[PDB]
């Protein structure tokens, strides 16, 4: 729901850090619009200026959204372009949304997404390796069912066997999260722990 996220993280490259130190010590070595003009300018722009959307700029808006979607984008991004172009027209005091603010909003949102949407803290590699570990746990449950009649097993020993036998080492929480997925699909039953396959 945040319209813009800004990665402030950066690494030292000694280019302007000398300039930052010099002007930071220049307040010790020595003693653009004014802030009150900014305050009255925002106060005049927020209520006395009413931009409108033209029918022309919507075509560039929709082909820009088509370009974003086939690159990765949601409709919240498009409505962010709409309100960003409205805010730029509020700044320019023209009371009209032109072409230029639309491409400026597209550029700014594009730079935000530079930093299939992969939201919900989910990457597609984790989204497929969860099902891969579910299949590996099903194979291990089938091997345990071939080994013994009882399908109930301890969580730590079965998790260690699944981590050693299936693939490279992953988190122990991922296997039990896939087992909770299988609880939701009702393929496997849990007690507690005890994990009984069907």
């Amino acid at each position: 729901r945040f319209d813009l996220v800004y990665l402030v993280l950066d690494k030292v490259d000694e280019k302007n850090d000398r300039e930052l130190a010099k002007h930071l010590t220049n307040l010790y070595l020595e003693d653009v619009l004014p802030v009150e003009f900014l305050t009255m300018y925002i106060s005049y722009a927020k209520e006395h200026i009413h931009p409108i959307i033209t029918e022309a700029a919507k075509t560039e808006l929709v082909r820009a959204y088509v370009g974003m979607r086939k690159m990765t984008a949601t409709t919240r991004q498009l409505e962010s372009m709409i309100r960003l172009a409205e805010a730029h027209a509020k700044m320019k005091l023209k009371n009209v949304v032109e072409l230029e603010d639309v491409q400026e909003a597209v550029r700014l949102i594009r730079s935000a997404i530079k930093d299939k949407i992969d939201m919900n803290l989910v990457q597609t590699g984790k989204s497929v390796i969860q099902r891969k570990l579910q299949e590996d746990l099903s194979r291990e449950i089938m091997n345990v069912l071939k080994d013994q009649a009882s399908d109930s097993m301890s969580f730590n020993e079965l998790i260690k066997q699944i981590n050693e036998h299936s693939q490279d080492r992953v988190e122990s929480s991922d296997i039990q999260e896939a087992l909770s997925r299988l609880q939701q699909e009702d393929k496997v039953i849990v007690l507690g722990g005890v994990r009984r396959s069907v």
Binding site: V12, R18, A21, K22, T25, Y28
Partner: protein
């Protein structure tokens, strides 16, 4: 024990002001510590640590009752920063 409390009051009374070439050396030393921050304790050099280095610099300017901050004073202050780095190691 009676003698320190007036000497530190005088040290608070002078408030020295430092020169520009010493500030250039401070800029070079800050660049060197950012290069060391490129190089275990994660703790890197910040602009706030640069202000701290400045604070140590005029603290020793206050103690020697001096009007300029000396260059060897600055490098001994950055040596104390290296001592803090050695403390971060051990």
């Amino acid at each position: 024990p009676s003698k320190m409390r007036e000497y530190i009051a005088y040290a608070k009374t002078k408030r020295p002001v430092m020169s520009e070439a010493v500030n250039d050396y401070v800029v070079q030393a800050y660049i060197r510590l950012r290069q060391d921050s490129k190089r275990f304790s994660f703790g890197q050099a910040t602009p706030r640590t640069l202000l701290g280095i400045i604070r140590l610099s005029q603290a020793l300017a206050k103690l020697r009752l001096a009007d300029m901050v000396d260059i060897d004073d600055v490098e001994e202050a950055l040596r104390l920063v290296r001592v803090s780095k050695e403390s971060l190691y051990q």
